[PDB]
Every structure is written in C-alpha cells, then in structure tokens.
Amino acid sequence: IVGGYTCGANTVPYQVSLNSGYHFCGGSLINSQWVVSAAHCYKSGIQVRLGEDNINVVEGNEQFISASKSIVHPSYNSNTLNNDIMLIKLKSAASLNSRVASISLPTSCASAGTQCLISGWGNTKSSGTSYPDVLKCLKAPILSDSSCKSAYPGQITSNMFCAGYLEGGKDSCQGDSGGPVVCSGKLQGIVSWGSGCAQKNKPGVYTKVCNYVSWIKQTIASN
C-alpha cells in the first residue's frame, strides 16, 4: 500500500496473509473455513495466516492454518486477468473472535464514488521497494466505468473496476494482491492489477466481487 497509513493491530480482522515461507499475497476471510483471494496468487503449499499485524514477529492472536483446497475460477484468464478470483478452504476452521472475523459478501454492486478500505502488506513505495512489517490501510473511492476504461482501454472487463486516485500517490501495490477492498462493510473488490503503483492516471484495478457471489456460494456449498 502506497500513501496509506498503519491500520493498527487487528483493526482489519478479515485480512489474511498468504505465506509460502514468506508473505506473497493477501486474502479475505469470508467464513470460518473460507478465504477469498486472487486467482493469480495460486500456488501449492499455501499457509493462511490469520490475526496478523506484524507479519515478521509472533505477537499473539495469530492462527496459521494450511490451505486444504485452493480453487481458481475455472474461467480465469492469466493473460487478461479476467475472473481473477480464487477460493481457499482452510484445513481446519479458524477460531473467530474480535481479532479474527469474517467480512460480508455484497448483496449488490457498489457505485462510483463509494469510499472503500484497501489493506495489505505490499510495497509502500511507488518507486523502488519497501515492505512493511505491519498492516497498511488506504481509503479510496471507486471510479466510474468511463474513467476506468479511459485509463486502461480494451482491458477492463465487466468483472473489473478501478479504485483510487488519478493524481497519483495512493494505491495498492506488489504484495497486496488478493487482499480486500471493503466498502460499507461488504467485500466489493480483490486487489488484482495496475500499471505500476500510485502512478498518475493509472488507478488500481480490482476484481468485481459482486459478480461472483453466486459462484462463491455454489462453490463453497459443493466443497
């Protein structure tokens, strides 16, 4: 997260870190057994780390749970990044408490201008590389269809949306992929892609979770 702020320990209790001997992506807890992340974050050997603040220190409140299923959307296209969503099933149910909690799925799509909270342990610099120990947060608005397509012509599908700031300086970045965009208590977005981070006229692009609620429910119910 570039241009954001320190969230504070466990203030984003649905935020998880995906770990393979290092943090490589985020995710969002949607019930005691299931995490939503990005399809492009798929790999073998994922350990889900819940209740994290400082990802490099055992502070208390952590739960480390192996992924038992990692389900990439069958129509994920690795070239266009359309359908960039993955469900992870935890080997055992997380213990839910104030510091580890699920986030609600949307009942409808959000509109342009709606403030959202984007969080993660990604790069904090738009030029070069600095990775934080603690969770970073950013408040960012959803952009209109017209500004999103203007920014990225021929690239925005119906399953994507833009959020952030066209003036530059504030964005998600490398290491934030898979993490939450939460708007009025609903998981509307998954950190997916963009041209660089926090660049002028190049906002972040996010998987449009409201298009996948039915698929998520159907997939969980059958697994």
Partner: peptide, 11 residues
Amino acid sequence: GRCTKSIXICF
C-alpha cells in the same frame, strides 16, 4: 506496463 500486485506478473 500492467502487472499483477503479487510477490514477486507483467504484460
């Protein structure tokens, strides 16, 4: 260029 925001994919 467009890239995913994972550690450590660009197009």
